[PDB]
């Protein structure tokens, strides 16, 4: 059961992105950007030629970047101009799905940097160092589906989830998680000087009854006491989708200990995925290995629960820990027209119909649902 | 004539503005004084002290690209306010490493290192140029090289990672750590044409040009048109175009190798030495294989279309679109020649001077005319060993009357004008050599700096005045032209006057002047190696050699110099006739024979040859009885008429081929 109150726009404005910046909702739409907070929907127009606003990251001010008519360009929050004139790798050249995260002041994104569009995963210039980019064909043309930053004890690391499409005898999709060192310095050489030197990846695995799911929809890493737990949502070309959970501690341990797939010899002293003390640069042997064989000979198996299967075609999902109990969540996952909630404790799924073209669910303290009608806020 | 001999063949050479001449020979890189006398300093890149080439490099066919270990060597930032100049040197060793260093005492610490900057394949091409780019005008370095060569042995793996596999041009930054290349600061490649060989890189009108040509390092044959890739002079590669250069005029299959390049700066004219595949060393070496072609930089700048022919573009596929436009050289200037190896163009007194280096140790300069028409080249200097001139000539920066000719393993500093042979005005002024002018105070044809010691500038009469403007006697007699002093004394024989005054004599304070149909078949022609002094007797064998009155032989060596037209000496048997060839310059002239009337019958090539210098005598001593076949090793022995043994003379036989004979 769910009662949602609707703060709608004046018109049905095609949603293009939704972000949470310090419990303030930033809904990038065509034309303006909407700002939800305290049930207050402040719309701010920027331009309207094409200008699909897609990015609303926060570095120092929450700058907001869009694509004004095939030219990507940023702004300050209130339509003002960006001092640093950011905007190349911050917004796509055309309306697309993006993945752009911002740590302290360090923007990482998969957004296309040029017009042609070779897919790469980049960290842009800032406190971490100069720009970086993954070698080609590493990131699939579909893009990076999830990205989040997590401590590795002492060094920040960036994790990204994507779905590769291998094609040898038949096309097989494979879900991957990939780790990189947030403060990587680049490779050793001059050509490989702006390339990640700590990029590694493992296959995930979400099997239930011999049906293995392989297409990532969306991810979210909740931070708990002993470690953080990663919730992935897989879709399938069949009529099903499946939420799995993985223990980031198990993943980190696997990254640090497992062996590189296809590489049989002894791994060098600064082990490939390992972060390095500030200013250090990966040697050449380690880098040659880490670029040739960048996949561990392993497979991350999910936690025991909650694995569950919902409909096919879910688009978003967000978690909200129940205030009464603890480590028991309500996972609100959203389809084009129908809300669904799932309680990790009772393992029952509730549903609800809503006559709108939903786009996302965000959760700050109460699930707010971003649909083309406008925003809604939910109370059961 | 100061020479500096290295031990291994020169790999590169640059000349700093005020810090001497850097020469990268083997594993070691030396710096010398502009007089090429003392190695002021020296760096060892591979191993200390021992700077022998780690591996052996085969000096290949003169048309084929050479090989070395010092890919990049270029000074920059020199002549700054207080900042001492820098020298950027990139070697094959260490995966094609490149270090910035202070331009000066070589044994100082390299400021910034960097790996995979230059091609680490000793026979791979590399050409770089620094420039100003960025929001703060840093010094960037655009490097075009042959990074990936399909010759990797499992022992050592040069070829960079699979991401940087098809990289041709990269815009390194000389400030970032290890000379970092941006993501977009690199220009990819199309993998179909084999490899590319880049010859040069220069800036012109806000852009960088890379003259290259496709090439098969395995085969050894060009696989396409010599082209020029034009890139925007920025921080990220902005491919602005590519244009092929069509210098195959005067040769059947065309000239598809680019042997050397040079941008005539003040004229906005590129000048390139093209050649066709000359078999194996010299087997298809024709009278027209090499050709100096001049292109207007404006035409290349305008005709270069961004087509994905050799380089990947973001808007097409490899060779799935237009073909690059073929730019035509300045027609009135192309100089055909049997063996050309290097070019260097400059402008002095508003006249283009193109020094050229031939594959037989000649440095000969041409002076372009009014409509950039080439004159017949004067031979400036000749290397006694006929070693092929290294493909880069560097002008002395501190004395603009010298140039540093590199050849094999020897560098030397030679003047740019052999004006001591001119003894009069006209000889000094009709030759139209811009560097040379008449000098009254000395009364000699000399450079400017060698005779502007008298402050009255008109003492050193140059060519811009005109050849007629030297002093002469005019009839009521007077002096005409441009004299240095305004006071003289005339004396005729016997009226005398003084000064601008009035046998005839005009004496000055520093100098003086005084004055009182059937067929016609050609079997062959012999010999085919005539020495430079000509040959009195060249036998042409054929048929029906008596059914004709006026039979002529026309030799043409250089598409600019005139033709040697001669009549038959004494018409022998209707199968044989005999000619007499005069002196000429070392060349490989084409020989047509035109009978009483008609087209020329091209009998075949005929090469003048340098005089035979005598290297060594194998036994060097034999018993007074003699009879031991003394062996003499030398060069150009095949052209020897015969031998003399002077002590009384003794005629003795000879059994010889090109290089040696007993
Ligand atoms: C929304 O706009 C009103 C209009 O002035 C302003 O008073 C209010 O502070 C704004 N709230 C946010 C969260 O931007
Ligand atoms: C110099 O080093 C090369 C390395 O290949 C070696 O072959 C040569 O013998 C060395 N010469 C001396 C004098 O050390
Ligand atoms: C170069 O520096 C070294 C280092 O001390 C010194 O020994 C040498 O004399 C210097 N040579 C020149 C020409 O400056
Ligand atoms: C190569 O770079 C490293 C890093 O600074 C430096 O220690 C080393 O001296 C460099 N090598 C040369 C030959 O300059
Ligand atoms: C020409 O180049 C291609 C590609 O590099 C190579 O496969 C081929 O062998 C070369 N030609 C010869 C005669 O080897
Ligand atoms: C220099 O480049 C500009 C850029 O378009 C061009 O218009 C101009 O013609 C160039 N200069 C010459 C002399 O061609
Ligand atoms: C013609 O005479 C020359 C010598 O003058 C001789 O070598 C040649 O064999 C003769 N040929 C014929 C066909 O008689
Ligand atoms: C000594 O005799 C050998 C025998 O062939 C010869 O090659 C050499 O030139 C002679 N003279 C020397 C070694 O000075
Ligand atoms: C002397 O040697 C040369 C080649 O070395 C040979 O052609 C010649 O016939 C020899 N003479 C005698 C008399 O053996």
Numbering used by the authors:
A (entry chain C): 12 to 391
B (entry chain D): 37 to 511, 520 to 537, 544 to 549, 556 to 558, 573 to 586, 659 to 789, 793 to 807
Quote the study on this structure:
Semaphorins transduce signal through the plexin receptors, which are single-pass transmembrane proteins localized on the cell surface. Ectromelia virus secrets a protein named A39R that is a Sema7A mimic. The class C plexin PlexinC1 is unique in that it only has two PSI and four IPT domains in the extracellular region, rather than three and six, respectively, in classes A, B, and D plexins. Structural analyses have shown that a dimeric semaphorin binds two plexin molecules through interactions mediated by their respective Sema domains, supporting the ligand-induced dimerization model for plexin activation.
To address these questions, we purified full-length human PlexinC1 and reconstituted the 2:2 dimeric active complex with its high affinity ligand A39R from ectromelia virus. We determined the structure of the complex to 2.9 Å resolution by using cryo-electron microscopy (Cryo-EM). We then reconstituted the complex into peptidisc, a recently developed short peptide that can stabilize the transmembrane region of membrane proteins in the absence of detergent. The cryo-EM structure of full-length PlexinC1/A39R complex shows that the pair of the Sema domain in the A39R dimer bind two protomers of PlexinC1 at two opposite sides, as seen in all the crystal structures of plexin/semaphorin complexes reported previously. The overall architecture of PlexinC1 extracellular region appears quite different from the ring-shape of class A plexins. The Sema and IPT2 domains in PlexinC1 make an extensive inter-domain interface. In particular, Cys412 in blade-6 of the Sema domain and Cys703 in the C–C′ loop of IPT2 form a disulfide bond to covalently link the two domains. The cryo-EM structure of the full-length PlexinC1/A39R shows similar convergence of the two membrane-proximal IPT4 domains from the two PlexinC1 protomers. However, due to the different architecture of its extracellular region as compared with class A plexins, the two copies of the IPT4 domain are arranged in an antiparallel fashion (See details below). Our structure shows that while the β-sandwiches of the two IPT4 protomers in the dimeric complex face to each other closely, they do not make any direct contact.
